[PDB]
Design a protein around this ligand. Structure first.
Ligand SMILES: *[C@@H]1O[C@H](CO)[C@@H](O[C@@H]2O[C@H](CO)[C@@H](O[C@@H]3O[C@H](CO[C@H]4O[C@H](CO)[C@@H](O)[C@H](O[C@H]5O[C@H](CO)[C@@H](O)[C@H](O)[C@@H]5O)[C@@H]4O)[C@@H](O)[C@H](O[C@H]4O[C@H](CO)[C@@H](O)[C@H](O)[C@@H]4O)[C@@H]3O)[C@H](O)[C@H]2NC(C)=O)[C@H](O)[C@H]1NC(C)=O
Ligand SMILES: *[C@@H]1O[C@H](CO)[C@@H](O[C@@H]2O[C@H](CO)[C@@H](O[C@@H]3O[C@H](CO)[C@@H](O)[C@H](O[C@H]4O[C@H](CO)[C@@H](O)[C@H](O)[C@@H]4O[C@H]4O[C@H](CO)[C@@H](O)[C@H](O)[C@@H]4O)[C@@H]3O)[C@H](O)[C@H]2NC(C)=O)[C@H](O)[C@H]1NC(C)=O
Ligand SMILES: *[C@@H]1O[C@H](CO)[C@@H](O[C@@H]2O[C@H](CO)[C@@H](O[C@@H]3O[C@H](CO[C@H]4O[C@H](CO)[C@@H](O)[C@H](O)[C@@H]4O)[C@@H](O)[C@H](O[C@H]4O[C@H](CO)[C@@H](O)[C@H](O)[C@@H]4O)[C@@H]3O)[C@H](O)[C@H]2NC(C)=O)[C@H](O)[C@H]1NC(C)=O
Ligand SMILES: *[C@@H]1O[C@H](CO)[C@@H](O[C@@H]2O[C@H](CO)[C@@H](O[C@@H]3O[C@H](CO)[C@@H](O)[C@H](O)[C@@H]3O)[C@H](O)[C@H]2NC(C)=O)[C@H](O)[C@H]1NC(C)=O
Ligand SMILES: *[C@@H]1O[C@H](CO)[C@@H](O[C@@H]2O[C@H](CO)[C@@H](O[C@@H]3O[C@H](CO)[C@@H](O)[C@H](O)[C@@H]3O)[C@H](O)[C@H]2NC(C)=O)[C@H](O)[C@H]1NC(C)=O
Ligand SMILES: *[C@@H]1O[C@H](CO)[C@@H](O[C@@H]2O[C@H](CO)[C@@H](O)[C@H](O)[C@H]2NC(C)=O)[C@H](O)[C@H]1NC(C)=O
Ligand SMILES: *[C@@H]1O[C@H](CO)[C@@H](O[C@@H]2O[C@H](CO)[C@@H](O)[C@H](O)[C@H]2NC(C)=O)[C@H](O)[C@H]1NC(C)=O
Ligand SMILES: *[C@@H]1O[C@H](CO)[C@@H](O[C@@H]2O[C@H](CO)[C@@H](O)[C@H](O)[C@H]2NC(C)=O)[C@H](O)[C@H]1NC(C)=O
Ligand SMILES: *[C@@H]1O[C@H](CO)[C@@H](O[C@@H]2O[C@H](CO)[C@@H](O)[C@H](O)[C@H]2NC(C)=O)[C@H](O)[C@H]1NC(C)=O
Ligand SMILES: *[C@@H]1O[C@H](CO)[C@@H](O[C@@H]2O[C@H](CO)[C@@H](O)[C@H](O)[C@H]2NC(C)=O)[C@H](O)[C@H]1NC(C)=O
Ligand SMILES: *[C@@H]1O[C@H](CO)[C@@H](O[C@@H]2O[C@H](CO)[C@@H](O)[C@H](O)[C@H]2NC(C)=O)[C@H](O)[C@H]1NC(C)=O
Ligand SMILES: *[C@@H]1O[C@H](CO)[C@@H](O[C@@H]2O[C@H](CO)[C@@H](O)[C@H](O)[C@H]2NC(C)=O)[C@H](O)[C@H]1NC(C)=O
Ligand SMILES: *[C@@H]1O[C@H](CO[C@@H]2O[C@@H](C)[C@@H](O)[C@@H](O)[C@@H]2O)[C@@H](O)[C@H](O)[C@H]1NC(C)=O
Ligand SMILES: *[C@@H]1O[C@H](CO)[C@@H](O)[C@H](O)[C@H]1NC(C)=O
Ligand SMILES: *[C@@H]1O[C@H](CO)[C@@H](O)[C@H](O)[C@H]1NC(C)=O
Ligand SMILES: *[C@@H]1O[C@H](CO)[C@@H](O)[C@H](O)[C@H]1NC(C)=O
Ligand SMILES: *[C@@H]1O[C@H](CO)[C@@H](O)[C@H](O)[C@H]1NC(C)=O
Ligand SMILES: *[C@@H]1O[C@H](CO)[C@@H](O)[C@H](O)[C@H]1NC(C)=O
Ligand SMILES: *[C@@H]1O[C@H](CO)[C@@H](O)[C@H](O)[C@H]1NC(C)=O
Ligand SMILES: *[C@@H]1O[C@H](CO)[C@@H](O)[C@H](O)[C@H]1NC(C)=O
Ligand SMILES: *[C@@H]1O[C@H](CO)[C@@H](O)[C@H](O)[C@H]1NC(C)=O
Lengths: 117, 442, 130, 120, 126, 45
């Protein structure tokens, strides 16, 4: 356990510790200290804004309506969840991450239109 | 029909607000405006046209102007803090004529690296920077700043060249822009659009003519808080630029002396070749065309009175002459050759100029700057973009009206670019009745 | 919390008596102070109660014309405890009024049963004789 | 359209664009103030939504009845004949009152939901 | 009819639950001087977000009152609900469990993560 | 009463090479005698 103690663990095993890293994202020279404090806040809020945009706010794990594109990865769920770390996983899809994020946002926009009816 | 309160977020509502704005600049000597500190600009800036929106603008109440003025002064002051203090420079000078009387050859005891030693220095000074000491011998002089302020040398490594500054607004706030083809900066604007930042604005400083600014799209635009009140400044934006070319023909030789540990003073040791007065050239045909067009638009506010242009009535050199920064040298030019004209409906102009090394751009008591001389021949060209005019009131004679250049309020230069912008707060929350009722458990 | 009462004394018929009830270890103003009487020929009987907070009192119909209840202003000891006292005065005493008198502390600050006499003082004897 | 592009449109027409608008040494000091200011305004609005129970939604129905003294207009008069800017002026003196009523209703709703769960 | 900010502080915990929105609102709203004001503004934001960070992790975000699946431990307190809700202020209560506050928080976080893991699995089986 | 003394000194001027003679009244509390104790010469505290 401990902060990032799961970093070398399998992606499935690591999911048991998500709350461990979710916490402690928050907490002349007076200016220097404030810039760092603001930066910690901005990064925290940046991630929270994305979750709000995706409709995932308030959840550690959030399912979406976006289908997986096999070109992002052809690996099976068993290979991904039990034979990889999250660090390795991010590298494999590092060039598709921004695309995936945009697709989630588009899917939420369609959902909002349907909820209005 | 039972109506219930429904909460909406993302609602398009705004109100006028005063905000802190920050600069942005395109990626790229050291610049005095410290634009390297600025946020990189978006490679493709966004603008949103607002249909069915009419908004009230008032360039004379626009607080972006006052904020920009404070930014310009604050940057100017910071740039002088590391630079040489020249406190030792203020000492009795003994002066003679050089080898127009615009220059004098002065001798003085300057300080040296060691406190025990002094060194005689000969240097040229402009007459404008010097005040005689009333021994009535005519040989003893002092620098003009000595009875008002300490003077600081501008660093030779810092350029005064203007760089466009984009003013950007914090999230949750936005800038509205007026797009009307002609707009006098006040009243309602029919075509309104929203931007995150302004177009880049050059921090050009001038006293009578506006240089290197934006042009009017179709017609000359005359702006004033109140035309009838002659006290108010009139800002005139031209459709087409008039090129003004300026030169300092003298080939200055620049020499330097250490005046203490870590410090040095720069001065002109001599001038090579004949000494000649600085001057600027404005094309006569373009200028006469420009004055006529300005007179035609001014005439529409005054009941078809004859339009007379005239030179400034008097006062301080900073007011009575056109000033600008060219090559890092500070010019003062006599515009009476430009504004001497009368219009009854029915080659080049050469303006003499003088250069000062001692300046006070913001008209602040207790402060002064010494510009270092720039070696060799100095030349530049600029576009006259607009005019600053005032009017002579107190007369009931309806035959004519008289206009004169310039004014004491430096902030009016910023207004000429900021007149089209307004800062508003965005308020995403709001409520309205609907038939919808919230569902509850059981 | 603890409650104590004025010691026993002998009175003549028709005499008035005043009984103190000093308290400690709890906030005095947070709870009702009850007065309850017991006699051999009657068993336990309520004399009603007083709230030190509002000064409001609920006197039982039997005692409304003969019993007066008052309280002292509380004096704090800790931020959550204080000391103070309640007093009860009985006028026109009769031989029928002989017996043990008790002071008691209210049960809760809220809910349906706030005034119940959770803590009781030791009680003292009142005697009437001619 | 774009950010605030709906501002001249009617209140009803604007409701489709809420998703779009839901989004969004000397100089360094001003940037620090700008960054703090942007954060305060974002959180200010989220604070109210979280209290109201409306968080995560662009449109949130409540249990507070409309008071005709706030406006006597019919829904067609409001939703189809007004901009949000015009509407904001009409209820400017009642907006804080409405907010308090929403908050009181939310606390009563959650208290009741707690009690229902206690009985199960 | 509001008691005002912290007006409920002397009230019983049950009564205090009526006023939670009074306290929840204004958490964000309520040169030598210039820097101190900037520090005050940043601090208020950190304070507000600190509590919100915990609520988002617990799944309690967006709610004034949030029930959980973590059982009460009698070692934290042996009091009955009437002894707590009708006989105590929140100020007194916080002191009674002050040593267990962090312990409880970790248990809530663990329960939330397992709950979401299970919710995903239930959906995967459909 | 010695509440005040009339002091004289050569003060600096706008120009480094020039000096001016200044006469001024000072409160005795701000004035300290030179340790030579001539009684005619003083310095600021
Ligand atoms: C500060 O601290 C004080 C002291 O702790 C707090 O006061 C307590 O507040 C609670 C609020 O709920 C009180 O609970 C209630 O208690 C009453 C008890 O009845 C008495 O009080 C009445 C006050 O109006 C009074 O009318 C009664 O007497 C009159 O009427 C009777 C009947 O006709 C008559 O016989 C008398 O002669 C009087 O004419 C009586 O003195 C009880 O009735 C309440 O019951 C309702 O509410 C509960 C809870 O919802 C509910 O379960 C019941 O079914 C019912 O609906 C209720 O229990 C408590 O008694 C107060 N304590 C004291 C010592 O006074 C105060 O609130 C704190 N302040 C702050 C700011 O937090
Ligand atoms: C209105 O707009 C016009 C158009 O933009 C402005 O005119 C242009 O202004 C620029 C900047 O002054 C000018 O470019 C310079 O040309 C000079 C020609 O002699 C150069 O000397 C100069 O470079 C030197 O100065 C720079 C100052 O920042 C240094 O960064 C640079 O390194 C040079 O200095 C070094 O080299 C010189 C070599 O001689 C040496 O003496 C120095 O000590 C140092 O080592 C620029 O390249 C354009 O030529 C102007 N354009 C025209 C058409 O004239 C005009 O100024 C604007 N008006 C106002 C009021 O702002
Ligand atoms: C750098 O600095 C040095 C030092 O200041 C300058 O050298 C001095 O130059 C001045 C002339 O400019 C010399 O002045 C002359 O001094 C004579 C002697 O002074 C008497 O009085 C002083 C006290 O005041 C005594 O110390 C001294 O012993 C003498 O008893 C005067 O007689 C001269 O007077 C005449 O000229 C002045 C000019 O203004 C007239 O007003 C008088 O009426 C009279 O005609 C004169 O004052 C001085 O002596 C020099 N100092 C030294 C140490 O040599 C440098 O010139 C200067 N360098 C530059 C470039 O400025
Ligand atoms: C650090 O890396 C090692 C090696 O990858 C990890 O070892 C593996 O740990 C898991 C448990 O976390 C073991 O899983 C179990 O395997 C048995 C069969 O051996 C099975 O019956 C269980 O149901 C379960 O799947 C796994 O076997 C083990 N691998 C090896 C090769 O021993 C270790 O867990 C890593 N540590 C962390 C904290 O992630
Ligand atoms: C501003 O306007 C004046 C007046 O038109 C310009 O003056 C002209 O400058 C040129 C170039 O220096 C002069 O021509 C040269 O004169 C010398 C004289 O010895 C000769 O040797 C060269 O072969 C050449 O002919 C010209 O005579 C002069 N005109 C006048 C009336 O003096 C000036 O150059 C303009 N300034 C700028 C920046 O354009
Ligand atoms: C600094 O010196 C200059 C030159 O002697 C002074 O200039 C004159 O000042 C008077 C007022 O005291 C004005 O009426 C004159 O018009 C000034 N003359 C010119 C040519 O500008 C100046 O006042 C002095 N400054 C101070 C603060 O005493
Ligand atoms: C000053 O004015 C001249 C025109 O008189 C500007 O130069 C012209 O600008 C237009 C518009 O960009 C171009 O189409 C022309 O080709 C330019 N002419 C030449 C000769 O280059 C010039 O840019 C203006 N200067 C400033 C600083 O605005
Ligand atoms: C700029 O344009 C505005 C709008 O046309 C002018 O303001 C109006 O001027 C007329 C002049 O007769 C007045 O009757 C109106 O009452 C003005 N309107 C308002 C809302 O004040 C304004 O005068 C123009 N400015 C200049 C300098 O000409
Ligand atoms: C524009 O300026 C004129 C001139 O100052 C203002 O009119 C004058 O108002 C004063 C009273 O304040 C009268 O005594 C003058 O007789 C007026 N002059 C004329 C020519 O009528 C006018 O009010 C200003 N307009 C605005 C909108 O402020
Ligand atoms: C200003 O004067 C200087 C000195 O005469 C000129 O530069 C010198 O020119 C001679 C002759 O070409 C060269 O041998 C020297 O090496 C030059 N000196 C330097 C430092 O470069 C200079 O060209 C003149 N400027 C103008 C515009 O005529
Ligand atoms: C600007 O130039 C004009 C024209 O040279 C100056 O006006 C002259 O000033 C001198 C001053 O001694 C007078 O002798 C002339 O009679 C004036 N000419 C006219 C036609 O009046 C004017 O003073 C200059 N402005 C400045 C600030 O120097
Ligand atoms: C422009 O208007 C002024 C008045 O504002 C006229 O001035 C008068 O001119 C006559 C000569 O024509 C003189 O005798 C007067 O003394 C002048 N008056 C003032 C108040 O100075 C001037 O003549 C007019 N110009 C034209 C071309 O008609
Ligand atoms: C109500 O509380 C009274 C005072 O005790 C204090 O508060 C209670 C809740 C505990 O925290 C205790 O440790 C404190 O000292 C009690 O005297 C009274 O009996 C309580 N009433 C009931 C019904 O429990
Ligand atoms: C400079 O020349 C002028 C004549 O042009 C003369 O009046 C003046 O006295 C001279 N100055 C000096 C210091 O010789
Ligand atoms: C100024 O005078 C000094 C001393 O005579 C001389 O060396 C110097 O060259 C002069 N400067 C000019 C430009 O004549
Ligand atoms: C001013 O204009 C008149 C013609 O209107 C002309 O005669 C006069 O010389 C001009 N003055 C100057 C200084 O150019
Ligand atoms: C509307 O507000 C007024 C405010 O005085 C109130 O009296 C009235 O009861 C309210 N109406 C409803 C239906 O709540
Ligand atoms: C709200 O109050 C302002 C004055 O503060 C008043 O001008 C406006 O008309 C009022 N609005 C309504 C709807 O009564
Ligand atoms: C209750 O607390 C004790 C420690 O006091 C701990 O050992 C026990 O496991 C806890 N019970 C539960 C269900 O958490
Ligand atoms: C918390 O622990 C300390 C010892 O570390 C103890 O003194 C204190 O009484 C405890 N608090 C409670 C409420 O049990
Ligand atoms: C000031 O200077 C003069 C020069 O003659 C000298 O006599 C006097 O003593 C000086 N005063 C002081 C206080 O040193």
């Amino acid at each position: 356990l401990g902060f990032l103690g799961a970093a070398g663990s399998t992606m499935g095993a690591a999911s048991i510790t998500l709350t461990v890293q979710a916490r402690q994202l928050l907490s002349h020279w007076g200016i220097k200290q404030l810039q760092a404090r603001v930066l910690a806040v901005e990064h925290y809020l940046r991630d929270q804004q994305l979750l709000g945009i995706w409709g995932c706010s308030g959840k550690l794990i959030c399912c979406t309506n976006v289908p997986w594109n096999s070109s992002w990865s052809n690996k099976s769920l068993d290979e991904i969840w039990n034979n990889m770390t999250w660090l390795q996983w991010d590298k494999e899809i590092n060039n598709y991450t921004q695309l995936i994020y945009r697709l989630i946002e588009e899917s939420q926009n369609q959902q909002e239109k349907n909820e209005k009816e | 029909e039972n109506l219930w309160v429904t909460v909406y977020y993302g609602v398009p509502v705004w109100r006028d607000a005063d905000t802190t704005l920050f600069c942005a600049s395109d990626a790229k000597k050291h610049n005095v405006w410290a634009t390297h500190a600025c946020v990189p600009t978006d490679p493709n800036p966004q603008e949103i046209h607002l249909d069915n929106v009419t908004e009230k603008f008032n360039m004379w109440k626009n607080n972006m102007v006052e904020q920009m003025h404070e930014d310009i002064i604050s940057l100017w002051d910071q740039s002088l803090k590391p630079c040489v203090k020249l406190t030792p420079l203020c000492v009795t000078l003994h002066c003679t004529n050089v080898t127009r009387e615009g220059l004098k050859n002065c001798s003085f005891n300057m300080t040296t690296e060691l406190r025990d030693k002094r060194q005689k220095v000969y240097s040229l000074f402009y007459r404008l920077d010097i005040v005689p000491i009333n021994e009535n011998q005519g040989s003893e002089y002092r620098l003009i700043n000595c009875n008002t302020s300490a003077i600081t040398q501008a660093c030779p490594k810092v350029s005064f060249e203007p760089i466009p500054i984009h003013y950007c607004t914090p999230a949750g706030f936005a800038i509205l822009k007026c797009k009307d083809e002609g707009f006098n900066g006040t009243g309602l604007c029919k075509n309104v659009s929203t931007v995150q930042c302004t177009h880049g604005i050059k921090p050009v400083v001038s006293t009578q003519l506006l240089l290197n600014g934006s042009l009017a799209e179709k017609n000359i635009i005359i702006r004033s808080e109140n035309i009838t009140n002659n006290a108010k400044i009139i800002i005139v934006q031209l459709v087409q630029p008039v090129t003004i070319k300026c030169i300092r023909p003298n080939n200055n030789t620049v020499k330097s002396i250490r005046i203490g540990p870590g410090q040095a003073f720069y001065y002109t040791g001599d001038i090579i070749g004949d000494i000649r007065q600085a001057h600027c050239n404005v094309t006569r045909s373009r200028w006469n065309k420009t004055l006529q067009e300005v007179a035609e638009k001014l005439r529409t506010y005054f009941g078809n009175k004859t339009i007379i242009f005239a030179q400034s009535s008097g006062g301080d050199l900073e007011i009575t002459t056109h000033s600008f920064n060219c090559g890092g040298e500070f010019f003062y030019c006599n515009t009476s050759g430009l504004f001497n004209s009368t219009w009854y409906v029915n080659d080049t102009i050469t303006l003499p100029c003088r250069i000062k090394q001692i300046i006070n751009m913001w008209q602040r008591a207790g402060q002064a700057m010494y510009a270092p001389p720039i070696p060799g021949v100095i030349k530049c060209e600029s576009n006259i973009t607009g005019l600053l005019l005032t009017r002579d009131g107190g007369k009931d004679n309806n035959v004519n009206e008289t206009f004169r250049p310039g004014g004491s309020d430096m902030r009016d230069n910023w207004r000429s670019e900021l007149y089209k912008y307004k800062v508003v707060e965005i308020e995403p929350l709001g409520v309205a009745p609907t038939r919808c009722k919230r569902r509850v458990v059981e | 919390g603890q409650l104590v009462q004025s010691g026993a004394e002998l009175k003549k018929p028709g005499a008035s008596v005043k009984i103190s009830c000093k308290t400690s270890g709890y906030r005095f103003n947070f709870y009702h102070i009850n007065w309850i009487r017991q006699t051999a020929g009657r068993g336990p009987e309520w004399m009603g109660w007083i709230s030190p907070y509002s000064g409001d009192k609920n006197l039982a119909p039997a005692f409304q014309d003969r019993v007066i209840m008052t309280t002292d202003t509380e004096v704090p000891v800790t931020s959550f405890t204080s000391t103070g006292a309640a007093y009860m005065e009985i006028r026109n005493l009769k031989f029928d009024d002989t017996g043990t008198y008790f002071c008691a502390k209210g049960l809760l600050r809220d809910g349906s049963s706030t005034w119940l006499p959770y803590l009781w003082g030791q009680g003292t004897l009142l005697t009437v004789s001619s």
